[PDB]
């Protein structure tokens, strides 16, 4: 296609080599640049002028091009190379506006799986005295990035007042999520306990807190 295109996703095994390719008419006679972006972070230039690495970029990144395609190669991929990679050009038309590829999300396979670390906080004294009550269930360091969360009041299920996030990618490529249970102060103070139950790949971690 004439437009600047790259596959939306590709995977590579730890320590293997992967080539990310961009294709478009604007690459003809053009020295492309490439940008790495991780969730929650600004883009970082990794290749410019077809094949030049900025200072600080490791030598396992390289670039090449011919005709209407340009490629970013990662040789000996490491876990920290998991990111979205965008190619960049300027169109030959008009006054040459800047165009980005759609980005290729690179998954690095073989990273360690992990059960979630779960911390459950009770309502603070300050919040209770403000006539509100929130339990905070923080869930981190799990891989793969899928989880389900359930809450208990004493031994019974409670679903009113529950709000739970989608999992988010941490800097170590594991995932995080949080779940909040809203209660009244009188409900909190009159129960024996409340529990957060986190299920991840068939196993469950439950934490319990009690008023005191």
């Amino acid at each position: 296609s004439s437009e600047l295109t790259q596959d939306p996703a590709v995977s590579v095994a730890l320590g293997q080599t992967v080539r990310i390719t961009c294709q478009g008419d604007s690459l003809r006679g053009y020295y492309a640049s490439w940008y790495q972006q991780k969730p929650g972070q600004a883009p970082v230039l990794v290749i410019y002028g077809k094949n030049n690495r900025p200072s600080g970029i490791p030598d396992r990144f390289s670039g090449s091009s011919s005709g209407n395609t340009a490629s970013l190669t990662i040789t000996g991929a490491q876990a920290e190379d998991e990111a979205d990679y965008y190619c960049n050009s300027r169109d030959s038309s008009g006054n040459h506006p800047v165009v980005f590829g759609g980005g290729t999300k690179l998954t690095v396979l073989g990273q360690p799986k992990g059960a979630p670390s779960v911390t459950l906080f009770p309502p603070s004294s300050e919040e209770l005295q403000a006539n509100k009550a929130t339990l905070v269930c923080l869930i981190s360091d799990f891989y793969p990035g899928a989880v389900t969360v359930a809450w208990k009041a004493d031994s019974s299920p409670v679903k009113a007042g529950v709000e739970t996030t989608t999992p988010s990618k941490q800097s170590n490529n594991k995932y995080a999520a949080s779940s909040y249970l809203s209660l009244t102060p009188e409900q909190w103070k009159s129960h024996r306990s409340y529990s957060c139950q986190v299920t991840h790949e068939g196993s469950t971690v439950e934490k319990t807190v009690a008023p005191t």
Binding site: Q37, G49, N52, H96, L120, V136, E163
Partner: protein, 233 residues
């Protein structure tokens, strides 16, 4: 050594005008450089907005040209972006950036003045919405025996019921970075956000150190510094 920092309003009303500034440090706006803007809608890719040189010359994305003005302020060493008639499609993180002098047209005398953006700001989050801004209510998440496991204790801060995004959290005015985990916000049924930030610390440091979370909600011009102390009582 050029570094860039965006500032923005957080919320812009629909059909209103977005105004952003980028503060340049470690270099002069008057140097040969293309001071640039890029944006990224939530969950989507990068879109270049435009560029300006110190002399006033501009180039804009043709799909945005009719609504964009980029300007430069020599004396304050800043450049800026105005985007008029905004809609929900303009909700995005906006980045300022620097591109060195370039020449990519076939008519260029030289070929080695490549185009690229090597320096990027942190980004500022712009939400186009008719709803009202609401500052957060911050509560401590005290360390206790039940939030401690062996030699490591968790403590944190709960940031409740704010709009729009984002909130940033630091600890001890930035002097505490190890073990800090600020979680992505939940979007509640009310349309308000809440998030938590937790730090893991040695359990033997709980009596000897002071822990303060610094919550910044720039959209509502609110900052809260919340002391987090062990439970006791």
């Amino acid at each position: 050594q050029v570094q860039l920092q965006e500032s923005g309003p957080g919320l812009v009303k629909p059909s209103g005008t977005l105004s952003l500034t980028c503060a340049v440090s470690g270099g002069s706006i008057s140097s040969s450089n293309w001071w640039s803007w890029v944006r990224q809608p939530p969950g989507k890719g990068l879109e270049w907005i435009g560029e300006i040189s110190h002399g006033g010359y501009t180039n804009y994305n043709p799909s945005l040209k009719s609504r964009v003005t980029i300007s430069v302020d020599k004396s304050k060493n800043q450049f800026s972006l105005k985007l008029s008639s905004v809609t929900a499609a303009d909700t995005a993180v906006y980045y300022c950036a620097r591109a060195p002098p370039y020449c990519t047209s076939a008519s260029c005398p030289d070929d080695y003045y490549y185009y690229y953006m090597d320096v990027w700001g942190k980004g500022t989050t712009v939400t186009v919405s008719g709803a009202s801004t609401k500052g957060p209510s911050v509560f401590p998440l005290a360390p206790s025996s039940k939030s401690t496991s062996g030699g490591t204790a968790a403590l944190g801060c709960l940031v409740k019921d704010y709009f729009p995004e984002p909130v940033t959290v630091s600890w001890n005015s930035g002097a505490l970075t190890s073990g800090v985990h600020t979680f992505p916000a939940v979007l509640q049924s009310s349309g308000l956000y809440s998030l938590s930030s937790v730090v893991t610390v040695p359990s033997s440091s709980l009596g000897t150190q002071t822990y303060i979370c610094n919550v910044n909600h720039k959209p509502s011009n609110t900052k809260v510094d919340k002391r987090v102390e062990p439970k006791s009582c």
